[PDB]
Every structure is written in C-alpha cells, then in structure tokens.
Amino acid sequence: STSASARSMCRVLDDLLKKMPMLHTGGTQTLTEFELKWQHWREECERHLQNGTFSSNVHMEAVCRVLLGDEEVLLEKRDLMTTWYHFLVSRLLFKHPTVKPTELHFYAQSSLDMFLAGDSCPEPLDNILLAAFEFDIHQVIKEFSIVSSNWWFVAHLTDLLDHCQLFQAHNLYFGANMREFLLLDYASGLFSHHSLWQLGVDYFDYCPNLGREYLKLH
Amino acid sequence: RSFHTQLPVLSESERDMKKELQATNQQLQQLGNSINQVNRKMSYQEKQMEKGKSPRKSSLTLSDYQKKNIKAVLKEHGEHIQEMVKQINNIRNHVNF
Amino acid sequence: TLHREMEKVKLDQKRLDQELDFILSQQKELEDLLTPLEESVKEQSGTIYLQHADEEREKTYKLAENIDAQLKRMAQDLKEVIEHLNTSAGPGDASNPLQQICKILNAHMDSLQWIDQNSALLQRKVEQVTKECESRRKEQERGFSIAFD
Amino acid sequence: LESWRQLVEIILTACPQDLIPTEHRQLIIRDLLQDLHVKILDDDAAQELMPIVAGAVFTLTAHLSQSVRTELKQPMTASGLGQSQYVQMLDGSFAAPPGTENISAGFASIGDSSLHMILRNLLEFILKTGGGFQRVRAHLYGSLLYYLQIAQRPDEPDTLESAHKSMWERLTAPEDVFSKLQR
Amino acid sequence: LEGFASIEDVQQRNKLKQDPKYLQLLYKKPLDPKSETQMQEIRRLNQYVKNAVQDVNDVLDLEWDQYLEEKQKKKGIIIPERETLFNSLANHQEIINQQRPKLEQLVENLQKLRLYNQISQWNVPD
Amino acid sequence: KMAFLTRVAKSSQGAIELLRSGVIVRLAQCQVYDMRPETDPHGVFGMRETPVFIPAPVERYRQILLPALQICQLILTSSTAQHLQAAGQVLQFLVAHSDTIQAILRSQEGSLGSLQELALLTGIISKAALPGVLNELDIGLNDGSMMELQGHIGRFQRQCLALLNRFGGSDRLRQLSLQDDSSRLDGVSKKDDMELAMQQICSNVMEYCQALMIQNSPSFQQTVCLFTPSLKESASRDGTRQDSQVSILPSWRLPSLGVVIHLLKQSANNFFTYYDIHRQSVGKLQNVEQLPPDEIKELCQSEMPVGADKISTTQKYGLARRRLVKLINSRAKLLSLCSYIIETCLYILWRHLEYYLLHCTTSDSQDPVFSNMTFGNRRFQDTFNTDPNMDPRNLRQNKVSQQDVDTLLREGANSFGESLQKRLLDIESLYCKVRSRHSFIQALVRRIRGLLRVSRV
C-alpha cells in the first residue's frame, strides 16, 4: 500500500507464501504431504522468477535469493540471524522440507563449520550445543559436569533422563549413583552458608546410603 | 607424505575424522603411559622370573599330533588371509581396469 | 621326462623374460612420467592457506601424521617387548601363541569387515546400474505405448 | 498346592476323562467348580501363591473344557437316539435327530445359572487382587480363553469369508442358552 | 598398476584444487577415499596395539602370579589351553564359512559387471 | 495380532476408525517393506541384490505382506464414506511400491500361497486402481501424478490379462495340483483350494469388468470393448499354457473374443462338474446315517491324513458329516461364483457384440453405422474409429476386412450349439443374479444369440 511499485509483487509473494506447510494432519504424521507442499512452493517460486513477476526489483530479488538457500548471503546479513543454531535452523528451513535425526547432526556440524569459517571464533557453549545436537546423553552430561559446576542442573537433567525411561549410568565414573553425589554436593554448598538448611533434610532423606551419616555429621 | 599440507576447506566427514583422531590421540597417550609403566614392571620382574621357575605352554599332552595340527591350521589360516588380501587387490585392479 | 621338463622350463622362462621386459618398459615409462611431477608437488606444498577451515584441516592432517608416527614407534616397541617376553613363557606350541591367535583373529575380523564393505559397494553399484537400465526400459516402453495409441 | 498341581497335571496330560457316565462327569465337574469358586472367594493366595493358584485355575478350566468336549461324543452310537432330552437343570429341553441327540444332550446338560455364577466368581477373583503380574495375568487370561472356547468358538484371520466358523458352539438363537449367557 | 592409479589420482586432485567448484564439491560430498583409508589404517593400528598390549598385560599378570605361587607354596600347575584352541579353530571355521558366500557374491558381481573383458583378452587394458 | 486386525477391520465403525488413524500410511511408512528382494518395472530389466537372510526370501516377503494386503482389501470392501480417500491412498502406496507388486504379479509358481497372493493383488488392483476411478475422483490433484497413476494402472491391467490368459485353462488346475499335492489323501483339499483361488481370480476379473457397468444404471446402451475379430484365441488357449514362466499374449494386437469363449465354456463345464459333485455329496450326507464303519473311516482318512482309526464310531460319523458339510458349502460357493462369472461373461459378450455392431467392424469403408465411440454413461472418448490404411489403431479395434468378422460370427454361431444353450438355460434357471441391476438374463441371451447369428454390414 505504501510503495507504488510493489502491489503486484507483494500479492505474488503472499500467494506464494500460502503454500507453506504448517504440519498437515491427514490422519497421522505423514511426510509425503510436507514434501509435496515444499516441492509445490519451490516450483511456484521458480515459475514466478522465470516469468518475471518476482524479478526487476532489488529488494524482492535479494529476498528470493535469501529464501532459495545460500550461505554467503546469510553470512553477510548475519545481523539478522543470531548464532550457529539460528544458522542451522535457517538452513533447515530454506533448504529442505524436513530432516532426519541421522542427518541432523551432520547438518548442525556443517552449519557450525561454515559459521566459524565466516568470521567467527570457537566457544565452549557452542561446543556444548554441538555435542547436544550430536546426542550421546552420557558424553553430553559428562561435558556438562566438566564445564559447568552447577550441580542442580545436572541433577535435573538426570531426573528428566530417568523419567524418560532411558538407559542411564549407575556410576559417577568413580563411584556409584550420580544423583546422590549431586545432592550431596548441593547440600554441602548450601550448608556452606549461614542460613536456610531445610532442603538438605529432604535431600539427605532421598539418599538411603551416605545421606544418613552426612546429616548426622553436619 | 607432502600432500598432508594442502586440501583447503573441510568436508562433511572431516569433522568426524577430527573427532576420531582426537579420540585416537587420547587413547594413544593412555596406551603409551601403560606401555611405559609395563616396561618398567617387566624390567623389574625379569630378574625375579629368571631366578624362579618358568611355566610350560605345551598343551595337549595325550595327543602328540594335535599340537602340530593346530600349528598347521594357524599357518594355513594366515596363508588364507594373505590369499584373500591378494584376491581383494586383484578384484580392485580388475575394477579399475 | 627330463627332456619334457627342461623344454617346459625353457618355454616358461622365455615367457617370463618377455613379461619382465614388458614390465621393465612400463616401469621406465612410469618413472619418466613421474619425474616432472616430483617438482610440482614440492612447489604446491608451500602454499599455506589462511582460513578457519584450511588451517583446521592442516592441523588435523599434522595431528594424524604425528599419531601415525607415534603409533608405529610404540608398535615397534610392543613388538620388541613381545620378542623379549617370548623367552619368559618357555617352550610350548609356538612360544606363547595367545598373542598370535588374538592378532590373526583381529586380522580376520577386519578382513571380513572389508569384504562386507566391498560387497556392499559392489551391490550398490549393480543396483544403480540396474535402476538406470530399468528407467531406460520404462522410457522405451512409454514411447512404444505412445506410438501404439 | 503342589500336590494339587501334580494331580491336575496328571489328569490333563497323563490320563483320559471318559469312563464314568457323562451326566455324573458333568455333575462332579460342576460341584468341584462351585467348591473351588467358594474357596477362591474365601481367599487362599496372597502374593507368592497367586501364580500357582492361577495355573491351577487354568488346569481345572482345561479339565472342564475336555469334559464338555467329551460329553458330546458317544462310544458306539447307541444311547444317542430319540428326541427331547430329559436331563436338564435350568435350560429347556433340546431335541435332535439320531446322530446329534448326544451333542444336544451334552449341550443342554450345562447349567445357565451355573455358568453365570462361575464367570462371576472368576471375574471377582480376577478383579480382587491387584498384584498379579505377568504370569498371574497370563494364566487368568488363559482360563478366560478356555471358558470362551467352551462357550463360543474361536476364529481365524482372513480377508473376506474364510474364517474358522463352528456351529453349535456359538452365541446365536435366543431360544437356546448361548444367546442368554452372552446377553 | 597401483602407482599408476596413485599418480593419476594425484594429477586429478592437483587439477581440481585450482577450481572454485571443488570447495562446494567437497562440502557436499559426505565421504572421501583418502580420509577413509587414513582412518581405516589408524583404526587398524589402534586395535592391533590395544589387543597386543592387553594380551601382554594379561601374560605379565599371569607370570607374576605364577612366580608368587612358586615362591610361596613352592608348587603349582598350569591350566591347559586345548579348549581355547578348539574354540579358536571353530570360530575360524565359522568365519570362513560365512566369508565363502561373500567371496561367491563378489566373484559373481565381478563377472556380471562386464569386467571380464580384460580376463578374456588376457591382461590387455585396450 | 492379524486376527484381531481382521476383526477390527471387518466392522464398519472399526474400518472408519482405522481409516481416520491411518493404517495404510503406516504400512507405507513401515521399514519392513523398504528392503525388498522384489523389483521389476514391467520391463525385462530389473533385479535386486539382498544380503543373506532367512530361506525363501520372496516367499517370506509375500507371507509378511499377506496380512497387510488382507486388511487393505477388507477396509476397501467395508469402507463407508471415506472409500474415496481410502482407495486413493491404497493406489498411492501401490504406485510407490509398484516394483515388488509387479514382481509378485510376474513371478508365479505352482504352490498354494502364491495363487492366493496373486488373487488378493488382482482384487486390490481392481478395487482401488481403475481408469473410471481416476476419472471420477482425484481428477483435480496433479494430472501428471494422475498420468503416472493411469500408467501403472495400465501396467497392472496388462499383468492381470496375462495372469488370466495363463490361468484360464481347465487343464491348469490339474497341472498345478500335482505341484502342491503333499499327500493323496489331502489332494482333495489341495485341488479345492486351487479351484477356490482360480474362482477368486475370476471373481476379481469380473468385478473389474462390472465396475464400469454398475455406474451405467439409468442407461444400458453403452459398449465397452477393445478386442479383435478372430476366434483363434479359443483354440490357442485350449491347448496348454505355462503357470511357471511368463506366457503373454501379443500386446501389439490385444486379446480377442476367443479367450472369452474359452472361459465361458470352461466355466460351464466346471459348473456342471460342481453341480454333479454337490448332488453326490448331498446324497452321501442324506445316506450317512447308515454308512459302513469302513466307509466312514475311509471318509475320515480322505478328510484328514492323520490316522483317525482308533477314534469312536460317533467321532468318525461326526468327522464325516463335517467333511460333507464343508464340501457341500464349498461346492455351493463354487456354483454361485461360476453363475455370477457366467452372467458377467454374458454382459461382456453382449457389449462386445454391440461394439462390433455400432462402433467398428470394417475400416476400409466410412459407413455411418460405425458412429460414436463413447464407452459408458460418462463422457469417455477413444482414438480413431475406422482407418482405410494400415494403422496401429486397427490392431486395437476391429480388423480392416469384413471376412474376419464374418468368420468370427460363423465360429461363434457354430460354438453356440444345443449343449451350450442348455447349459446357459440351466444356469439361468438355477441362479438369478444376487445384486440390484434389473433382471436382464433372457434379454442378454437373446441379444447375444441374435448378434451372433446375424452378419455385419
């Protein structure tokens, strides 16, 4: 409505964006409908670009070049995206309809690689996120316990992994039961203070082993 | 040997190669420490082993032919391994032909 | 019998001489073709690229070379350790044959894995060729049906 | 209980059940069923004896099924003639031509209220305990499957009209007793 | 022939290094023969070293235990290895009987992939 | 599990629930149907190199696919309002897995389960893969996808025609019985299963043929034919076919009315044979009350090969009665299916004669009698009509010579003797349809007789 040379352009853009797949449910989770919608969207975009209704304008041409799925254009316009996870989700949205867990780690690794190549530096949190994307719960919680000293976060993560009914480790890479060690560490850190010692009682009652003698000594 | 200083830009499998090489490096350091301590242990215990007694390793005493049969079987298995390596080489050569 | 044997031996030796002459000619040709290539790789090795991925790949290759060198050195160390410990077990079937048994078992396992990988690659290539032939046959059948209709 | 299990195992896979008359067979079977149902209503198992008593229930249900199956057959086909059987308890009299009169007599000899209270006691014993694990629930479901085999008939997978269909042992015809029991 | 293939691949990669599309080609390729054989040799050496040092440590521990027994109790025996040898022989036989169909399939594929022309011409690349 | 699936698919509410949940989509997305050792896209080229698995790879794959095809046919037959989308997703899955489907259709043996699998596949194709179905529904969802749909439908129709030409011989029954006869005592049940599979194949064929005439209910003046005027196909099929390899008719000229005549004659002969066997079985069941013990023992041995000699006389009588009841039910089903297939063959012959009369007969003359080419009540078209010169369309339609049509009519009138007339009369007297389509048996009979005894101008 503002620019006089963009009415039909925005109309064509809105008509093209209507073919976006918003997770169809034709009975169950089907990827065929998503793939067909993505193919139809790509075909409509290519047809518009070849006809000319989506050309002869620098702004919309750059928009289409970004939507097609490139890397150098996004590295130049990095002021819009956030970090490596934003780059990865942008690639997965503008390059493929959907991805599988067998290729998600590969795509995330390639995203982090080209993001670091395009003027960047390594980062411990970035490496932790890359490990989380590469899965292996044992090694990601090992990296978490190595880097971050927050015992409550590791305790919550172990509780979630136990609630999810997954195979967990019964040893703390030296003794046994990681949740008991985390609760004992939090109890020590809380007793280091001079106030609030009520949660330690229940956290020691939850441990039917060293918690009794620990509370009796504290 | 001089080609390991070129090849610009990583690939899709280069990061997996890097992480596997890091795992192999830490495993090699651990095994090197183990070998270093085992060498000292053996250098300290060799005199005691020579002063004491040496055990036997000749198995199957009731059958005097089973030992040579097992030895010939192991030699023929090694020959089969060599022949299979040669056959794989010939197969890839004929494929490249 | 001796005459037949020496005649067969002379024929085989003449054939082997011809084969060795051909092999020597091929080796001389390979050497003459490789002589100008020995100086081209030396000049390309000095071109060090400066990038977040190029330097990463260079460091990865250097670490791989160092790992291979250290592995070869410590493998020679383990070999001499085994050859020194062979006198500790005393006489036997093959002087402590457990090491040789484990070595040949691992070698046969790796050979089986390589054979399986090669067979999978050959089956994939055969399947790709068969799919190309099937697509060609389907196109031909579609053209024939169009010409018939 | 182990002696009872050995006894029922010998009755199942060691000795047949076709010597005394079928009427006395069914009478003794129904009396034993009512007795064991009163026993399981008065409780006998706790936590460790539940699989054993469930296996015993399965074995006695198999015994009842074998008795019902043998009640229909006859030796040399001599007493299975005539019509209008006079041996009933709650169900009406059934008539059949020579050749099916024995089957009709064996089918009408079963008591409607007897089967009703049997299934009610079985369901009550199933719903009473809550600690019955895999073996207990499997034995109880096998007993229920044997009861349903006695009542109706099993089927087989197909695509149109090719399933295992057996007559008599069904749930049709409201004038008989199978439809009333199913209702 | 191996050296000829190696110098051919060397020339090919040297010609491809001076191309701008080689970057995208390597970025899109999920595998590479050089890195594949490198990691293969690395894993082979690692497994060989691991099993060798494990058996060496086991033999050293057994020898130390035998020496301690001969120094304390002044007597002892050695357990036989006939069962272990028979198990190893059976395992080798089973692995070779499983590899024989693989060899048959490889031979069939090599004969069906129109690659027997060289064997028919008796080692002729033309 | 598959029995429970069949049970929940038999009901209408259960079928609606399964269609709303997505059982066909789940079966298509399953991983057990990806690595298949069956791949053949109609053409001669096509193979598969699968790793070492359990013995009989294709047989085990067909056995695993059997419950899926069974429940698919069941939900397609018992569908309520979602039948359109059900057939749509079924055809989509069949097109996605057309490799193994065509491989199974092309690979046939003389076993027992192979014939049942082929019959089920043919029925599923006839129920959820038709040009009329494509023209009715899904016509506004990518015609290129619909183009591939009709291409695969034509391929499946060619495969079904080949299977019909292979299994349309009466001697094929006894040829395949010797391949699966495990014992001479169970040979009766083996041949019964073989003839049941053959009748199921013929039922799927007639259902595919009648799927176009059911829609043409308000008007019955349409012809659906595409054969050639040559009755030599009857003599070519009366010989001996091969149920183990690939016996395909010349596709460059299409089948003719000889195959239909041979099928009708074989169906009438099998109908008479089954009627005689059913009468004998009824007599045996009526006289079973006084059968000798040796006779009832022989009957039990013929029923089951197990040594059933130590059982009681009442047990032997019950087993003999059960065997007789099963045989009577099987013979009644066979007679009903034969009568229905004969009525469908009469429909086919009448529509083919009407096509030859008022569509195409001689291509060397542009006569006004050979007008119109609409097939069915809907708006269907056809390529060309009459070509004076040599054209491939003449091989699909009638020949360019009137002598061929005259010889075909003469051979048909000679084959339509008193025996076949009495057979058709007995069939129409013992059976009178089963569905709702107005009684037209006598009309079809008299029209076929008139069009066979008359000549074309």
Instruction: Give residue for tokens 């440590």.
Output: E57
Contact F233, F259 (CB under 8 A): yes
Instruction: Give residue for tokens 């179905």.
Output: F133
Contact D61, D55 (CB under 8 A): no
Tally of residues, chain A: 218
> For the purposes of burial, counting CB atoms within 10 Å of the CB of F228, is it exposed (0-12), middle (13-18) or buried (19 or more)?
buried
Q: Name the packing angle between helices F402-415 and F257-286 (round to 10°).
A: 10
- Contact residues on chain C for A117, CB-CB shorter than 8 A: 51-53
Instruction: Give residue for tokens 């599979």.
Output: F197
Q: Does B12 lie at the interface with A, CB-CB under 8 angstroms?
A: yes
| C-alpha dihedral sign at D124, D129, D134, D135 | negative
CA dist., res. A184 & res. F455, Å (int): 105
Phi/psi for A141 (5° steps) reads: -75, -30
Long-range contact pairs involving A17-22 (C-beta distance under 8 Å, separation at least 24):
A19/A44, A21/A97
Contact D55, D139 (CB under 8 A): yes
Paired residues of B57 in beta bridges: C92
Long-range contact pairs involving F300-306 (C-beta distance under 8 Å, separation at least 24):
F301/F185, F302/F185, F302/F188, F304/F185, F304/F186, F305/F183, F305/F185, F305/F186
Residue type, C30: L
Contact F340, F224 (CB under 8 A): no
CA dist., res. E39 & res. E26, Å (int): 18
Q: Does B67 lie at the interface with C, CB-CB under 8 angstroms?
A: yes
Smallest Cβ–Cβ distance between B18 and the set C54, C60, C65 belongs to C60
| C-alpha dihedral sign at C28, C34, C38, C39 | positive
CB neighbour burial string for E115-124, b if at least 16 within 10 angstroms, e if fewer: eeeeeeeeee
Smallest Cβ–Cβ distance between B35 and the set C74, C91, C95 belongs to C74
- Contact residues on chain E for A114, CB-CB shorter than 8 A: 27
CA dist., res. F281 & res. F260, Å (int): 31
- Start-to-end CA distance of chain F, whole Å, equals 63
Rounded to a whole number of angstroms, the distance from the CA of C142 to the nearest CA of chain F is 9
Q: By C-alpha distance, which of B55, E56, E46, E63 is closest to C80?
A: E56
DSSP string, F166-231: HH--SHHHHHHHHHH---TTTHHHHHHHHHHHHHHHHHHHHHHHHTTTTT--S----------S-T
CA dist., res. F413 & res. F433, Å (int): 26
Q: A72, A84, A88, A109: which to substitute to probe chain B, counting the most B Cβ within 10 Å?
A: A109
The one-character DSSP state at C49 is -
Q: Does A139 lie at the interface with B, CB-CB under 8 angstroms?
A: no
Q: Does A75 lie at the interface with C, CB-CB under 8 angstroms?
A: no
Write down which chains contact chain D via at least 3 CB pairs under 8 A: F
Phi/psi for C92 (5° steps) reads: -175, -150
Rounded to a whole number of angstroms, the distance from the CA of F97 to the nearest CA of chain E is 26
Q: How far is CA A182 from the centre of its chain?
A: 26
Contact F153, F124 (CB under 8 A): no
Q: From the CB of residue F111, how many other CB atoms can be counted at a distance below 10 Å?
A: 13
Residue type, B24: T
CA dist., res. D107 & res. D178, Å (int): 10
Phi/psi for B57 (5° steps) reads: -130, 5
Smallest Cβ–Cβ distance between F26 and the set A26, A28, A32 belongs to A28
Do the chains D and B touch each other, judged by at least 3 C-beta pairs below 8 angstroms? no
> For the purposes of burial, counting CB atoms within 10 Å of the CB of F296, is it exposed (0-12), middle (13-18) or buried (19 or more)?
buried
CA dist., res. D17 & res. D21, Å (int): 10
Q: Which of residues 46-105 of E touch B (CB under 8 A)?
A: 46, 49-50, 53, 56-57, 60, 63-64, 66-67, 70-71, 78, 80-82, 85, 89, 92, 96, 99, 103
Rounded to a whole number of angstroms, the distance from the CA of C52 to the nearest CA of chain A is 5
Element (H, E) at F116: helix F113-128
Q: B15, B18, B22: which to substitute to probe chain A, counting the most A Cβ within 10 Å?
A: B15
State the Cα angle at A13 between A11 and A16, rounded to 5°. 110
Smallest Cβ–Cβ distance between E55 and the set C30, C98, C116 belongs to C98
Token reading at A94: 């503008």
CA dist., res. A191 & res. D118, Å (int): 65
CB neighbour burial string for F178-215, b if at least 16 within 10 angstroms, e if fewer: eebbeeebbbebbbbbbbbbbbbbbbbbbbbbbebbee
State the Cα angle at A123 between A121 and A127, rounded to 5°. 120
Token reading at F167: 């299994």
- Closest residue in F to E106 (Cα) is F49
- Taking phi over 0 as left and psi of -120 to 50 as alpha, with beta for the rest, C30 belongs to alpha
Contacts of F389 (CB under 8 A, 6+ apart): none
Paired residues of C92 in beta bridges: B57
CA dist., res. F42 & res. C141, Å (int): 9
Rounded to a whole number of angstroms, the distance from the CA of E79 to the nearest CA of chain C is 13
Q: Which SS3 state, helix, strand or coil, does residue B57 take?
A: strand
Contact F126, F208 (CB under 8 A): yes
Contacts of F32 (CB under 8 A, 6+ apart): F64
Q: From the CB of residue B83, how many other CB atoms can be counted at a distance below 10 Å?
A: 10
- Contact residues on chain C for F53, CB-CB shorter than 8 A: none
Please tell me the number of Cα atoms within 13 Å of F188 on its side-chain side.
15
Smallest Cβ–Cβ distance between B52 and the set E2, E71, E80 belongs to E71
Rounded to a whole number of angstroms, the distance from the CA of E82 to the nearest CA of chain B is 6
Interface contact flag, C108 B77, Cβ < 8 Å = yes
The runs of H, that is alpha helices, within chain B are 14-51, 66-96
Q: By C-alpha distance, which of F412, F393, F35 is closest to C127?
A: F35
Q: F314, F315, F328, F334: which to substitute to probe chain D, counting the most D Cβ within 10 Å?
A: F314
CA dist., res. F237 & res. F167, Å (int): 10
For chain C, how long is the longest CA-to-CA vector? Answer: 88
- Kindly list the distances between the CA atom of residue F325 and the CA atoms of D97, F282, F302, in Å, as whole numbers in the listed order: 16, 9, 14
- Start-to-end CA distance of chain A, whole Å, equals 73
CA dist., res. F350 & res. F225, Å (int): 10
- Start-to-end CA distance of chain B, whole Å, equals 26
Contacts of F431 (CB under 8 A, 6+ apart): F335, F336, F339, F340, F343
- Kindly list the distances between the CA atom of residue F82 and the CA atoms of A27, F12, F295, in Å, as whole numbers in the listed order: 12, 11, 54
CA dist., res. F234 & res. F165, Å (int): 10
CA dist., res. F83 & res. A198, Å (int): 65
Contact F61, F37 (CB under 8 A): yes
Rounded to a whole number of angstroms, the distance from the CA of C101 to the nearest CA of chain F is 28
Contacts of C37 (CB under 8 A, 6+ apart): E7, E10, E11
Contact F98, F116 (CB under 8 A): no
Contacts of C49 (CB under 8 A, 6+ apart): B8, C55, C58
Residue type, E71: K
Rounded to a whole number of angstroms, the distance from the CA of C146 to the nearest CA of chain F is 11
Instruction: Give residue for tokens 């001479």.
Output: F184
Please tell me the number of Cα atoms within 13 Å of F263 on its side-chain side.
30
CA dist., res. C95 & res. C99, Å (int): 10
Contact F313, D75 (CB under 8 A): yes
At how many Å resolution was this determined?
Answer: 8.7
| C-alpha dihedral sign at D73, D76, D81, D85 | negative
CA dist., res. F386 & res. F398, Å (int): 9
- Contact residues on chain B for E27, CB-CB shorter than 8 A: 9, 11-12
Q: By C-alpha distance, which of D177, D174, D165, D171 is closest to D152?
A: D171
Interface contact flag, C51 A117, Cβ < 8 Å = yes
Torsion angle defined by CA atoms of residues D177, D178, D179 and D183, in that order, rounded to the nearest 10 degrees: 100
Q: E55, E82, E96, E126: which to substitute to probe chain C, counting the most C Cβ within 10 Å?
A: E55
Contact D32, D83 (CB under 8 A): no
Tally of residues, chain C: 149
Interface contact flag, E27 A110, Cβ < 8 Å = yes
Q: By C-alpha distance, which of A3, A8, A35 is closest to A19?
A: A35
Contact F344, F209 (CB under 8 A): yes
CA dist., res. D164 & res. D104, Å (int): 22
Interface contact flag, D73 F6, Cβ < 8 Å = no
Interface contact flag, A117 B12, Cβ < 8 Å = no
CA dist., res. F145 & res. D19, Å (int): 72
> For the purposes of burial, counting CB atoms within 10 Å of the CB of E49, is it exposed (0-12), middle (13-18) or buried (19 or more)?
buried
Torsion angle defined by CA atoms of residues A201, A206, A209 and A211, in that order, rounded to the nearest 10 degrees: -20
Phi/psi for C51 (5° steps) reads: -160, 165
Rounded to a whole number of angstroms, the distance from the CA of B62 to the nearest CA of chain A is 48
Contact F411, F231 (CB under 8 A): yes
CA dist., res. F196 & res. F180, Å (int): 14
Torsion angle defined by CA atoms of residues A34, A39, A44 and A50, in that order, rounded to the nearest 10 degrees: 160
Smallest Cβ–Cβ distance between F46 and the set C134, C141, C145 belongs to C134
Long-range contact pairs involving D106-111 (C-beta distance under 8 Å, separation at least 24):
D106/D22, D106/D68, D106/D71, D106/D72, D107/D72, D107/D168, D107/D177, D108/D177, D109/D22, D109/D23, D109/D26, D109/D71, D109/D85, D110/D26, D110/D68, D110/D177, D111/D30
DSSP string, F243-282: SSS-----TTT---HHHHHHHHHHHHHHHHHHHHHHHHHH
Interface contact flag, E96 B80, Cβ < 8 Å = yes
The runs of H, that is alpha helices, within D13-111 are 22-41, 50-72, 101-108
Rounded to a whole number of angstroms, the distance from the CA of A94 to the nearest CA of chain E is 17
Contacts of B28 (CB under 8 A, 6+ apart): C67, C70, C71, C74, E46, E49
Do the chains A and B touch each other, judged by at least 3 C-beta pairs below 8 angstroms? yes
> For the purposes of burial, counting CB atoms within 10 Å of the CB of D92, is it exposed (0-12), middle (13-18) or buried (19 or more)?
exposed
Q: C119, C124, C127, C129: which to substitute to probe chain E, counting the most E Cβ within 10 Å?
A: C119
Contacts of F211 (CB under 8 A, 6+ apart): F126, F130, F132, F133
CA dist., res. D90 & res. D83, Å (int): 18
Q: How far is CA F325 from the centre of its chain?
A: 27
Q: Does A109 lie at the interface with B, CB-CB under 8 angstroms?
A: yes
State the Cα angle at D144 between D138 and D149, rounded to 5°. 125
Q: C137, C139, C142, C144: which to substitute to probe chain F, counting the most F Cβ within 10 Å?
A: C137
Phi/psi for D34 (5° steps) reads: -65, -40
CA dist., res. F296 & res. A178, Å (int): 76
Rounded to a whole number of angstroms, the distance from the CA of B11 to the nearest CA of chain E is 5
CA dist., res. F408 & res. F62, Å (int): 42
